[PDB]
Design a protein around this ligand. Structure first.
Ligand SMILES: Nc1ncnc2c1ncn2[C@@H]1O[C@H](COP(=O)(O)OP(=O)(O)OP(=O)(O)O)[C@@H](O)[C@H]1O
Ligand SMILES: [Mg+2]
Lengths: 15, 486, 39, 187, 105
């Protein structure tokens, strides 16, 4: 699920 | 997640030929790759002619076109009130997604014979000339026809604004939800309209479906049906809506371009053979139900922009034959001072008297009679000093009444104030006042009546008639103010 | 304040998308597995 | 006169002659015979000599069809093939012959059950996963079909795979995925 | 040849469809075999629609149309004064030729 890892990693990057 | 698709043999001008889709339905919503939706109109043996609800620059040849499996529908519900959507429901006011839960088709069938009842309850607009002489009812289709820049949009705006008194009020059966479909108008004018409706707290209960000039022809073709479906949602669930198509001529023009690009045989003025079918299946959905179905209503006020009073064109003739009357505006009246420039002689309401309260009926009968007697002789003005004195009084009272019919913008009067002013104008009280002062009077007097006689207006509104008690009270107040007025 | 809440939210929502683009055959094998479970 | 229609339809004059021959052959059971002879006469009418003579707009229709009869009759043509040839010639429909043949081939591409499907991915694939994918997208089919795999490779899709099988079409590429992301997060 | 010359596929009402003439330009003056000239107005994918500068009686299906490379051109100059010429610069006043040293498109 590259979509989900993308979402979580970009959330951790933006935070 | 597998969907039946088809390639694009050709694209352009809003028309895409699609190879494949061997199970597409007629008038079915297809969905391209770029996110654009479309409607499959032509089903031919070798391809499918699809109209695109967007711009044709996002589609190239060989582009995949998925199905959706549903007839074109738009979301309906109370969650639309106050928004500005496009022809497909997608909000363009930039205020988050529409929180609607149900959808309704755009090509639904109008109610039959049985679910209808006669038009009886009034649809107050606030324009004296309309609410008195050309009355409208709930469930009626009153065309508003005229040239360009005569005040049709303005009459629709006043009709929308006026329902504030009933909307903010307590009654549930007299609340009217407005819908304003805009077709082929500049986005700037739609923005002016939305700010004018939010400055008057009218957007609290109004939907706006905007298919502007820069929008593709299929969007302008669809916009009225989306609006009518949104209004039908209220109509079938016991509420009372009111829809204004501004205007239908430009929707006809969009349909004409679409049909010509779909290779369909043109008819008169190049319109397709079934533009009457288009407008009539749109307008017949404006009905007035019965108590066995919900008692709802849906009043339509289609607008038509002629060219030099040419009501004998194709589209004006169709829309006149379908509707339940008309309100003919004029540029001559619009220059000669009358604003709103309603032409009383040409305008007509087929329902008419059935769509008035008893008070407005009592006063409007004699008003219309005297106005007819004035128009049948108005040509003899500029030589009135050399004419019979009775007909001279006829002419004078006629001029008095016409100046009583002028009205400012965005100021829709309440019904009781309407009947009060028309009463003060019809009983000869202004025969002694010269015309250039009437408006002054009409202002000051009205203020007086709403300042120190609120109970009288409350009673007239609670009964809807000028009882002999209230008649005598009106005699009193008008006499006293005339005596006090300069 | 809320406008800045929007301006930075709208910028941060595109940056993260134009950022992941530079980011393994595990996805293709998963697709055949997803296709295996197509039935 | 009743005609039997092929399970797939082609249109235009190409499709009309194609279905005419399909009905004419299925009424005497010579489908494969006329199909192979059609492909061969298509190869014949594309060699530069006759392929250049056939489209000269002045050579008389009678003389052209007679010369064409002379040329085809030497390959031991069954009556149906030369019948179609003369029907095309006396109707001036010769420049379309190959097209018709092409169309007819596709008709057989449905009589044998050949389902053409495409699986487009970023990079070329090795045939172990390709064979298990043949097995996978072969599971969809009903009783009695054969399948034609035509896979292409496009890095513009940045990964995933797109399965366009006949009319069915699944889009598992990362591109439509990230477009879904953009449109969903923006809304 | 079929690059600088074509063959009349059809003729009638002063419109000759010419097959071939692949290298002909638009609005170029071609010459039929019968001396009659025409102007290639339609450049269609299959043929060329030529408008005949004369009577279509002298043109039969199958005639040869030769390119000339000369787009329409009329003589000019002070010598043209006093002379009745036709639509192509040929004198029709029966007073001999015209001493036109310069031409112009
Ligand atoms: N009742 C009125 N009294 C005075 N002026 C008015 C009245 N109604 C409208 N006007 C003015 O007349 C002008 C044109 O009015 P309006 O736009 O409503 O007519 P229109 O037919 O809709 O024109 P268009 O087709 O271009 O939209 C407006 O500037 C408006 O301010
Ligand atoms: Mg308007």
């Amino acid at each position: 699920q590259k979509l989900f890892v993308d979402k979580i990693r970009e959330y951790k990057s933006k935070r | 997640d597998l969907e039946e698709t088809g390639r694009v043999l050709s694209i352009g001008d809003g028309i895409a030929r699609v190879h494949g889709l061997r199970n597409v339905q007629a008038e079915e919503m297809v969905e391209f790759s770029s996110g654009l939706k479309g409607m499959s109109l032509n089903l031919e043996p070798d391809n499918v002619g699809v109209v695109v609800f967007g711009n044709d620059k996002l589609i190239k040849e060989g582009d995949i076109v998925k199905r959706t499996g549903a007839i074109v529908d738009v979301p309906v519900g109370e969650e639309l009130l106050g928004r500005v959507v496009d022809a497909l429901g997608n909000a363009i006011d930039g205020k988050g997604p529409i929180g609607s839960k149900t959808r309704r088709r755009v090509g639904l069938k109008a109610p039959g014979i049985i679910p209808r009842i006669s038009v009886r309850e009034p649809m107050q607009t606030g324009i004296k000339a309309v609410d008195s002489l050309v009355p409208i009812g709930r469930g009626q289709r009153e065309l508003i026809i005229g040239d360009r820049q005569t005040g049709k949009t303005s009459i629709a705006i006043d009709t929308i604004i006026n329902q504030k008194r009933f909307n903010d009020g307590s009654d549930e059966k007299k609340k009217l939800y407005c819908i304003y479909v805009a077709i082929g108008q500049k986005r700037s004018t739609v923005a002016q309209l939305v700010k004018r409706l939010t400055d008057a707290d009218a957007m609290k209960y109004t939907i706006v479906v905007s298919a502007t000039a820069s929008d593709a022809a299929p969007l302008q073709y669809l916009a009225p049906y989306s609006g009518c479906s949104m209004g039908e949602y209220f109509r079938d669930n016991g509420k009372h809506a009111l829809i204004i198509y501004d205007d239908l001529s430009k929707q006809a023009v969009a349909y004409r371009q679409m049909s010509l690009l779909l290779r369909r045989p043109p008819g008169r003025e190049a319109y397709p053979g079934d533009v009457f079918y288009l407008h009539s299946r749109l307008l017949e959905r404006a009905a007035k139900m019965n108590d066995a179905f919900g008692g709802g209503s849906l009043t339509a006020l289609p607008v038509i922009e002629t060219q030099a009073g040419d009501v004998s064109a194709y589209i004006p003739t169709n829309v006149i034959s379908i509707t339940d009357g008309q309100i003919f505006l004029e540029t001559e009246l619009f220059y000669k001072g009358i604003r709103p420039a309603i032409n009383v002689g040409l305008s007509v309401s087929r329902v008419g008297s059935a769509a008035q309260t008893r008070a407005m009926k009592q006063v409007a009968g004699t008003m219309k009679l005297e106005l007819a007697q004035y128009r049948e002789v108005a040509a003899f003005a500029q030589f009135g000093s050399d004419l019979d004195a009775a007909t001279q009084q006829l002419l004078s009272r006629g001029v008095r009444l016409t100046e009583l019919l002028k009205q400012g913008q965005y100021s829709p009067m309440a019904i009781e104030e309407q009947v009060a002013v028309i009463y003060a104008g019809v009983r000869g009280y202004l025969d002694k006042l010269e015309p250039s002062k009437i408006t002054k009077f009409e202002n000051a007097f009205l203020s007086h009546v709403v300042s120190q006689h609120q109970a009288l207006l409350g009673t007239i509104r609670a009964d809807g008639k000028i009882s002999e008690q209230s008649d005598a009270k009106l005699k009193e107040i008008v006499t006293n103010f005339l005596a006090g007025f300069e | 304040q809320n406008m800045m809440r929007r301006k930075e939210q709208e910028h941060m929502i595109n940056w993260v998308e134009k950022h992941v683009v530079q980011s393994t055959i595990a996805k293709c094998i998963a697709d055949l597995k997803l296709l295996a479970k197509k039935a | 006169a009743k005609l039997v229609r092929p399970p797939v339809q082609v249109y235009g004059i190409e499709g009309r002659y194609a279905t005419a021959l399909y009905s004419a052959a299925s009424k005497q059971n010579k489908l494969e015979q006329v199909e192979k002879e059609l492909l061969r006469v298509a190869q014949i009418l594309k060699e530069p000599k006759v392929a250049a003579s056939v489209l000269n707009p002045y050579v008389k229709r009678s003389i052209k069809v007679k010369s064409l009869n002379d040329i085809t009759a030497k390959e031991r043509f069954s009556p149906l093939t030369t019948n179609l040839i003369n029907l095309l010639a006396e109707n001036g429909r010769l420049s379309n012959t190959q097209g018709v043949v092409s169309a007819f081939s596709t008709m057989m591409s449905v009589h044998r059950g050949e389902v053409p499907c495409t699986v487009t991915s970023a990079s070329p694939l090795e045939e172990a996963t390709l064979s298990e994918l043949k097995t996978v997208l072969k599971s969809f089919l009903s009783q009695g079909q054969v399948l034609k795999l035509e896979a292409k490779t496009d890095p513009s899709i940045l990964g995933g795979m797109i399965v366009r099988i006949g009319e069915k079409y699944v889009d598992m590429s990362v591109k439509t995925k990230i477009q879904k992301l953009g449109r969903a997060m923006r809304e």
